[PDB]
Amino acid sequence: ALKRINRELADLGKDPPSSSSAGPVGDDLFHWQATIMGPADSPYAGGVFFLSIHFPTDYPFKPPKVNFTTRIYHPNINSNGSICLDILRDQWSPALTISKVLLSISSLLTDPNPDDPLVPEIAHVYKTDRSRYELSAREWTRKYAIG
Amino acid sequence: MQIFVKTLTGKTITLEVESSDTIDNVKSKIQDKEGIPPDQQRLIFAGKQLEDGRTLSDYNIQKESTLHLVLRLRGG
Amino acid sequence: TIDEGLYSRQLYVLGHEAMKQMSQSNVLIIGCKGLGVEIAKNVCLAGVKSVTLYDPQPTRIEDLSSQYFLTEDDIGVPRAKVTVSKLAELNQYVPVSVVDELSTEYLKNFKCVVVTETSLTKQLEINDFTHKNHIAYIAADSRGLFGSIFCDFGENFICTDTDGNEPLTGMIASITDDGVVTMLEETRHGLENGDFVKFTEVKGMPGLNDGTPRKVEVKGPYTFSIGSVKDLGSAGYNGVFTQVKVPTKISFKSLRESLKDPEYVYPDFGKMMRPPQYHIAFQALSAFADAHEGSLPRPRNDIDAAEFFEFCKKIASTLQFDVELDEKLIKEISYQARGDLVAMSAFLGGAVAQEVLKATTSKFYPLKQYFYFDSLESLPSSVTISEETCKPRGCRYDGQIAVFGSEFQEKIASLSTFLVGAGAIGCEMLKNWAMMGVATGESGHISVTDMDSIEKSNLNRQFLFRPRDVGKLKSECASTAVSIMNPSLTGKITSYQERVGPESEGIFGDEFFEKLSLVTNALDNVEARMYVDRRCVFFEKPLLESGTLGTKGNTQVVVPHLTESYGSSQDPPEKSFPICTLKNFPNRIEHTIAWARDLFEGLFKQPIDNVNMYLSSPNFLETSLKTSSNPREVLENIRDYLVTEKPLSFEECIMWARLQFDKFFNNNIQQLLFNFPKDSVTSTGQPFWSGPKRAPTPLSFDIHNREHFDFIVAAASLYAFNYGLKSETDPAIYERVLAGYNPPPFAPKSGIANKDKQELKSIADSLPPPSSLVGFRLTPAEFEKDDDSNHHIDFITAASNLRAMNYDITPADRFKTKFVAGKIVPAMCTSTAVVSGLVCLELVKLVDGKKKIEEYKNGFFNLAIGLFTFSDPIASPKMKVNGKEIDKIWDRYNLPDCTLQELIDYFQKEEGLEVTMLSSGVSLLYANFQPPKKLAERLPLKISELVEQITKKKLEPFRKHLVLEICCDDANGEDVEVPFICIKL
Ligand SMILES: Nc1ncnc2c1ncn2[C@@H]1O[C@H](COP(=O)(O)OP(=O)(O)OP(=O)(O)O)[C@@H](O)[C@H]1O
Ligand SMILES: [Mg+2]
Ligand SMILES: [Mg+2]
């Protein structure tokens, strides 16, 4: 557990992710805070989203718990910050690094999936009235993800 | 060479392997046929648990040999 | 009419029909020694109609070696007479009787006949009768470290269930015109060739939905074939398939026919030449006993060994056995003839009891027909085993001294064991230790810990407890019971009610652990197993692990500096469903049960906790606002459960339950169908509600419907419990109150600044002040499956079935709902007996201090199919550190309480390695990439001071060591793995 977590931390330190920055909270190795920058070619451009990562006692044999702290208007992210990502529930394997999870979350942000949604109302808006979805996403990322 | 794998639940699996194959290849075949990751597979032949990095010929596993795929249980 | 309050865990293994057949079957057991009493105990706990005992032989002292219902005050009394009274207490539904005389014609009253400690001529006489009258016959034998079982269920035995697995079911994607059935994306059917399946909900091929089973030809992990479906249709879309299990006809041979041409069951494939040897050996034992007035060969006697080998030669010649006799093995069988070990008795008794249940239920695959087993690797080699050491001393351990000797008895009597857990395996282990004489010496001791209490469902497989003991601590009851069994254990057992974990290190500290000899786990979760494994690795103590599940079980041994620990391997993890599947798109009853459990928690537990916390913590509002993810939900919960929706009578509870019914089974479905109409399509043109997504339909409340009324009753009762109001059960009041209900109108909402903070503040000030309500609390609901009067399982079942009705899923009953929601682990007494026997067979290997790794065995078994397998433990991996061989698991660095700088310098100079990371527990003490100022602040501090500073917590006075994890790099910059550090405070 500790060996793997420190290996990931050192690997992050050597090569900056540029688009992300994750690290332990205070000195606790099992509670990290990460930052994701909104993709330029997305409604969330120019926004910073904070995520909380909880490594279980059985890491890497159980998935880390990743939640959004900032509020985001996304079809696959609900009000509690839960993320509809397969690799975090049952497809988790002890071979995926935190950087891979951050890349997966960024790819989720750059294009949502309304065909298997977590928030049906936002998915309906996205599928029927795209422009209103764009306006709502920009408003939310301007009044929550900036400042 | 053809070998058989018997699970603790009674299922039987037929694998087409060669005497020079490593245990890693056999575990990958078992994963393909069953979906069990290689790190969670416990294979037993003739009272020896097969370990990664070695070959079948190291355990003298020949054609029509029977292996057992087992697992640990949490109750009790 | 099965008492599900007692057979709860056993019904999940066998079922209602199997136990119904069991409750009408009579079992006769001939012989009341350790093996016979073990079989009778397991059968009485199982729940057969009745048990009859036949053993008129007077009791002897040596019989106490494995007979735990015999005392030293019963010498000279027939064994059955003194055993029936104690066997009659195990289960109140199973009478136990004794017959002083047995006749052949009397055998027709019994469904199964078990024979132990009987000569071969009598066995032939009994089997000649039972075989022709279709009576199940089992014969078991235990000689020292050798055992044998023989089963004969008749020529026309019908086995309805062969492997004991649940039928396989799966969702189809498309069925071609040639019968090629394909599963959904990345889904495995799990079928084998020759299976039978039946289809339902198949679109385009109605013929397949009749229910006629069809042969299966597996063409891969994702597709199979059923034949030609040309006539029924062209192609079928969607649908589900379910496996059909067909009965099998098994034909057995009589003992007389089976002696000449036996059929063997091999418990180990590493030694496949032995069972033919044991077949001759046991018959030679019978002949020797017949030629010596029923006396077996004396322990370690060479004259008797020679005569026995002559008998073996004669029998092998007579039976035309073309096998070369192994003289050493056969004479070993001769030497240990008078041995009577409680571990072998428990192992064989569990196996034989499972066979009896198979006979009486026609379930699972029986042994066919001979099962010869040996544990000869347990024979000590560090002591002198000879005729002088193995002679009887006139004590209760004669049956064990006849195998191991007096010196090994002295070694056993000095053990200082630690048993973690006091469940079924714990009770069996304690019995085995008491019988073996463990810790009865001047320097022996036993410590047992368990924080749980005895419940009604535990009495089905934990035989040390009685109905009078319900509500008491398991460890104390077990210690008292075993002290009753073996009086020499009086004052040599200490019982704790402490949970073993990080919070109990003050009791199970360095001083406690340094005195132990071995640790035995009897737990039921992996977290505690891993913790105890780490503690044993740190203190370098042997560990005995065991686990069971239904009819399956395993046992593992961890030996310091020899094998790998328990935590060096992985097990499959628990499966959790995606949140999107549970929340909106369920397709299995498990999804609806999980949703119903979440609904229970969110309706009766979380709001109550929020209200209680608000009325206790003076500054709860600000902390919740700045901490909770959704403070608006917390404020709404507090308002609703304090002022807005506070009930003043049970009628208001009924109205609230009706409102919740509308909210969760009619309105959310309407909203979902407004967002995704049934005719909607995805972005690729496919229909949305296809495959794993089932289109729901809102429910309209009908009072006369059973599920609706059940939900209303359960919800109203739980709400009244929350508010402490009297709850009625008469349907008249419910029907009278709900008659005058006007549903508020509902229309799905299409959607379409910081002023909301003003609304939040208005809600916050609308709440009554905490000082206005002093001494007022709301009782939360803590989930409890085992109580049938708290409406927990009732509510979960009703909600799950209503949501299934929403999505057209097949509902389940309270039995399956309780199994799924409660995370109940199926359990059996037979599997517990088998695992205890195997663990106690490895224990004597540990006591002897065997060094080679080929002498230890890890065991796995499945009794439903009669599978046993053993394998050597995996040796601990090695590594090269500074050109030295280091054990990767069992080695550590021992350092004083030096400074961080001194530790770094020591590693740089002594080991030649550069330290890059140093952590303790869950904190990072030192890292190479930290800023220089922080390091300069931390470098000159001692390790204890550094840990205290970083964790902001003083070290406890009892803390005598620190465990540090270190990552270091060599001169070239390559990372080299090193063992952990043990700082001595
Ligand atoms: N960390 C622990 N420390 C000590 N004892 C433990 C610990 N975890 C579990 N146990 C005990 O181990 C035993 C497990 O055995 P078992 O599962 O048969 O019992 P149970 O959990 O009470 O029963 P059931 O699972 O049938 O409801 C129980 O006594 C449980 O209290
Ligand atoms: Mg319990
Ligand atoms: Mg349990």
SS3 for C754-806 is: CCHHHHHHHHHHHCCCHHHCCCCCCCCCCCCCCCCCCCHHHHHHHHHHHHHHH
Distance separating alpha carbons of residues C403 and C385, to the nearest angstrom? 8
Relative orientation angle of helices C706-723 and C792-807, to the nearest 10 degrees: 140
* CA-C500 nearest atom, ligand 1: 3
* Contact between C965 and A24 using a beta-carbon 8 Å cutoff: no
CB proximity list for C755: less than 8 A, separation 6 or greater: none
Phi, psi of C77 (to 5 degrees): -105, 145
Among C449, C450, C508, say which to mutate for ligand 1: greatest number of ligand atoms within 8 Å of CB. Answer: C450
Assigned token pair, C926:
């030192």
Residue of chain C minimizing CA distance to A115: C682
Cross-sheet strand order for the sheet of B48-49: B12-16, B2-7, B66-70, B42-45, B48-49
Taking the C-alpha atoms of residue C965 and residue C336, their distance in angstroms, rounded to an integer, is: 50
Q: Look at residues C192, C252, C900, C866 and name the one whose alpha carbon lies nearest to residue B12.
A: C192
Residue C871 has its nearest CB partner, among B36, B47, B76, at B47
Interface test with B, best of C271, C819, C871, C874 (most B CBs within 10 A): C871
Q: Which region, left, alpha or beta, applies to residue C117 given φ > 0 means left and ψ of -120 to 50 means alpha?
A: left
Asked if the Cβ–Cβ distance from A125 to C751 is below 8 Å, we say yes
Of A5, A37, A53, A84, the catalytic one is A84
Q: Which two tokens stand for residue C539?
A: 């203190």
- Give bridge partners of residue C554 from the DSSP assignment: C547, C860
Q: DSSP class of residue C242?
A: E
DSSP string, A1-19: -HHHHHHHHHHHHHS--SS
Domain at C570-824, CATH class: mainly alpha
Rounded-to-integer distance, Cα C860 and Cα C551, Å: 11
Q: Show the DSSP H helices in C196-295 as ranges.
A: 255-260, 274-291
Distance of CA C452 to the CA centre of its chain: 16
* Environment class of C549 (CB within 10 Å of its CB; exposed 0-12, middle 13-18, buried 19+): buried
C803 exposure class (CB count in 10 Å sphere: 0-12, 13-18, 19+):
buried
* Contact in structure between C236 and C338 (CB atoms under 8 Å): no
DSSP symbols for A122-137: HHHHHHH-HHHHHHHH
SS3 category, C153:
coil
CB–CB of C870 and B47 under 8 A? Answer: yes
Q: What DSSP designation does C535 have? A: H
- What is the C-alpha separation between C281 and C278, in angstroms, rounded? 5
Estimate to the nearest angstrom the gap between the alpha carbon of C520 and the chain centroid.
16
The alpha carbons of chain B give a radius of gyration, in whole angstroms, of: 12
Domain boundaries C892-985, CATH class: alpha beta
Instruction: Give dist(CA C94, CA C99) in Å, integer.
Output: 16
Q: Is residue C217 within 8 Å of C224, Cβ to Cβ?
A: yes
Whole-number Cα distances in Å, C617 to C522, C639, C766, C770, C771: 41, 16, 18, 9, 11
> Who contacts C450 (Cβ-Cβ below 8 Å, separation ≥6)?
C421, C422, C423, C426, C473, C474, C475, C496, C497
> Right CATH number for C411-569+825-891 from 3.30.70.1450, 3.40.50.720, 3.20.20.70, 3.40.50.150?
3.40.50.720
**Ligand 1, atom 28: closest residue by C-alpha:** C423
> Within 10 Å of residue C959's Cβ, how many Cβ atoms?
15
- CB A120, CB C676: distance < 8 Å: yes
Structure tokens at C384: 């002198």
* Tokens found for residue C541: 């103590």
Q: Where are the alpha helices (DSSP H) in C182-322?
A: 255-260, 274-291, 302-318
The H or E element spanning position C150 is strand C146-152
8 A C-beta contact, residue A10 and residue A97: no
- Which H or E run contains A68? strand A65-68
- Please name the residues in contact with C604: beta carbons below 8 A apart, sequence gap of 6 or more: C718, C719, C721, C722, C780, C781
In DSSP notation, C337-400 reads TT---HHHHHHHHHHHHHHHHHHHHTBSPPP-SEEEEE-GGGS-SSS--STTTTS--SSTTHHH
d(CA C856, CA C235): 57
Domain carrying residue A8:
2-143
Q: How far is CA C355 from CA C151, C278, C364, C866, in A?
A: 8, 21, 9, 9
Ramachandran region of residue C196, left (φ > 0), alpha (ψ -120 to 50) or beta? beta
Query: Does the beta carbon of C5 lie inside 6 Å of ligand 1?
Result: no
- CA-CA-CA-CA dihedral for C391, C394, C397, C398, to nearest 10: 40
Structure tokens at C100: 């002083």
Residue C942 dihedral angles phi and psi, to the nearest 5°: -70, 160
Report the alpha-carbon angle C504-C507-C509, nearest 5.
Answer: 95
Torsion sign over Cα C949, C953, C955, C957: positive
Are C547 and B76 within 8 A, CB to CB?
yes
Backbone φ and ψ for C914, nearest 5 degrees, come out as -100, 125
To the nearest 10°, report the CA torsion of C490, C496, C500, C501. Answer: -140
Tell me the ligand closest to C9's alpha carbon.
Answer: 1
Helix (H) or strand (E) holding C332, with range, is helix C327-335
Task: Tell me the three state secondary structure of residue C584.
Answer: coil
- Cβ-Cβ contacts under 8 Å for C383 (sequence gap 6 or more): C389, C404, C405, C407, C408, C411, C848
Task: Answer whether CATH 3.40.50.12550 is correct for domain C115-165+245-410.
Answer: yes
Indicate the SS3 state at residue C117.
coil
The one-character DSSP state at C683 is T
Cβ distance C227 to C179 under 8 Å? Answer: yes
**Helix or strand holding residue C430 (H, E):** helix C424-436
- Hey, how many other C-beta atoms are within 10 angstroms of the C-beta on C640? 13
- Residue C968: active-site member: no
Ligand nearest to the CA of C503: 1
Torsion C93-C94-C96-C102 (CA) sign: positive
**Are C832 and B76 a contacting pair at CB < 8 A?**
yes
Q: What is the DSSP string of C834-898?
A: HHHHHHHHHHHHHHHT---TTS--EEEEETTTTEEEEEPPPBPPEEEETTEEEETTT--EEE-S-
Measured distance between the N- and C-terminal CA atoms of chain B, rounded to whole angstroms:
40
Residues facing residue C793 across a β-bridge: none
DSSP at A138? H
Residue C900: what residue type?
L
How many Cβ pairs closer than 8 A exist between chain B and C? Answer: 108
Single out the residue of A27, A87, A10 nearest to residue C950, CA to CA.
A27
**How far, CA to CA in Å, does C383 sit from each of A110, C653, C823?**
73, 75, 48
Q: What is the CATH number of the domain that holds A6?
A: 3.10.110.10
Q: Contact at 8 Å (CB) between C409 and C400?
A: yes
Angle between helices C302-318 and C327-335 (to 10 degrees): 120
Q: Which residues of C are annotated as a binding site for ATP?
A: 9, 424, 450, 458, 461, 474, 500, 524-525
CA distance C95 to B62: 54
Give the torsion through C-alpha atoms of C6, C10, C11, C14, to 10 deg. Answer: -150
C-alpha pair distances (Å), C819 with each of C25, C167, C513: 27, 17, 38
d(CA C549, CA C914): 48
Are the folds of C115-165+245-410 and C411-569+825-891 the same? yes
Domains in chain B and their CATH numbers? 1-71 (3.10.20.90)
Tell whether ligand 1 has an atom less than 6 A from the beta carbon of residue C530.
Answer: no
Fold of the CATH domain C1-114: FAD/NAD(P)-binding domain (3.50.50)
Closest among C108, C113, C140, C109 to C54, alpha carbons compared:
C113
For chain C positions 719-778, those within 8 Å of chain A (CB to CB) are: 751
Neighbouring residues of A98: CB distance < 8 A, sequence distance ≥ 6 = A8, A12, A22, A32, A34, A53, A64
Q: CB distance from B11 to chain C under 8 Å?
A: yes
Q: What angle do CA C974, C978, C982 make, to 5 degrees?
A: 145
Bond from prior residue into C92 cis (ω within 30 degrees of 0):
no
Residue C507 Cβ inside 6 Å of ligand 1? The answer reads no
> Are C542 and C565 contacting, i.e. CB atoms less than 8 angstroms apart?
no
User: Can you name the CATH fold of C166-244?
Assistant: Elongation Factor Tu (Ef-tu); domain 3 (2.40.30)
Q: Minimal Cα distance from C162: which residue of B?
A: B10
For residue B26, count other CB atoms closer than 10 A to its CB. 22
- Asked if residues C70 and C142 have their Cβ atoms less than 8 Å apart, the reply is no
The residue assigned the tokens 């328990």 is C566
Answer left, alpha or beta for residue C668, where phi above 0 means left and psi between -120 and 50 means alpha. Answer: alpha
- Contact residues on chain C for B8, CB-CB shorter than 8 A: 552, 860, 862, 867
The structure tokens 């501090």 sit at C941
Read off φ and ψ for residue C920, nearest 5 degrees: -135, 125
SS3 C184: coil
**How many CB atoms neighbour CB C532 within 10 A?**
25
Protein residue with its CA nearest to atom 19 in ligand 1: C423
What region does C769 belong to: left with phi over 0, alpha with psi -120 to 50, or beta? beta
Nearest Cβ partner for C165 among B9, B70, B72:
B9
The resolution of the experimental structure, rounded to one decimal in Å, is 2.7
* Closest by CA position to B47, among listed B71, B67, B24, B26: B67
No. of helices (H) and no. of strands (E), chain C: 32, 34
C-beta atoms surrounding C395 within 10 Å: 17
Which among C411, C424, C431, C425 has a CA at the least distance from the CA of C483? C431
Residue C731 CA to residue C192 CA, distance in Å, equals: 51
Contact A80, A72 (CB under 8 A): no
Nearest Cα to Cα of residue C162 among C643, C862, C968, C895: C862
Region for residue C293 given its phi and psi (left: phi exceeds 0; alpha: psi -120 to 50; beta: otherwise): left
Whole-number Cα distances in Å, B56 to B15, B22, B29, B34, B51 = 13, 6, 14, 20, 10
Residues C782-793, buried b or exposed e (16+ Cβ, 10 A)? eeebbeeebbbb
Pairs from C912-916 (Cβ < 8 Å, separation ≥ 24): C912/C882, C912/C970, C912/C971, C913/C882, C913/C968, C913/C969, C913/C970, C913/C976, C913/C978, C914/C968, C914/C969, C914/C970, C914/C971, C915/C966, C915/C967, C915/C968, C916/A10, C916/C967, C916/C968, C916/C969
CB neighbours of residue C226 within 10 Å: 20
- Token pair, residue A109, equals 């942000």
* Contacting residues for A63 by C-beta, under 8 A, at least 6 apart: A56, A87, A88, A89, A92
Partner residues linked to A85 by β-bridges = none
Q: What is the 3-state secondary structure (H, E, C) of chain B?
A: CEEEEEECCCCEEEEECCCCCEHHHHHHHHHHHHCCCHHHCEEEECCEECCCCCEHHHHCCCCCCEEEEECCCCEC
**Nearest Cα to Cα of residue C238 among C197, C208, C213:** C208
Question: Among residues B12, B59, B76, which one has the least CA distance to residue C867?
Answer: B12
Q: What is the DSSP letter of C458?
A: G
The continuous run of DSSP H or E covering C224 comes out as: strand C223-225
Here the contacts of C85-91 (C-beta below 8 Å, separation 24 or greater) are: C87/C37, C87/C40, C87/C41, C87/C44, C87/C51, C87/C53, C89/C466, C90/C41, C90/C44, C90/C45, C90/C463, C91/C44, C91/C45, C91/C47
Give how far the C-alpha of residue C146 lies from the chain's centroid of Cα atoms, to the nearest Å.
28
Using CA of residue C678, residue C682, residue C685, residue C690, what is the dihedral sign? negative
How many domains would you assign to chain A? 1
The best mutation among C498, C524, C785 to test binding of ligand 1, ranked by most ligand atoms within 8 Å of the C-beta, falls on C524
Domain parsing of chain C, residue ranges = 1-114, 115-165+245-410, 166-244, 411-569+825-891, 570-824, 892-985
- Say how far apart CA A124 and CA A114 lie, in whole Å: 8
Experimental method: cryo-EM
CA-closest residue to ligand 1 atom 13: C423
Tokens for C40?
A: 């009778």
For A81, name the nearest residue in chain C, comparing CA atoms only. C629
Per annotation, catalytic residue among C395, C427, C580, C829: C580
Work out the burial of residue C73: count CB atoms within 10 Å of its CB; fewer than 13 is exposed, 13-18 middle, 19 or more buried.
Answer: exposed
| CA-wise closest residue to C446 among C359, C527, C517 | C517
Please answer whether residues C872 and C856 qualify as being in contact, where contact means their C-beta atoms are separated by less than 8 angstroms.
yes
The string of DSSP letters for C478-515 reads HHHHHHHH-GGGTT-EEEE-PPPSGGGTTTSSHHHHHT
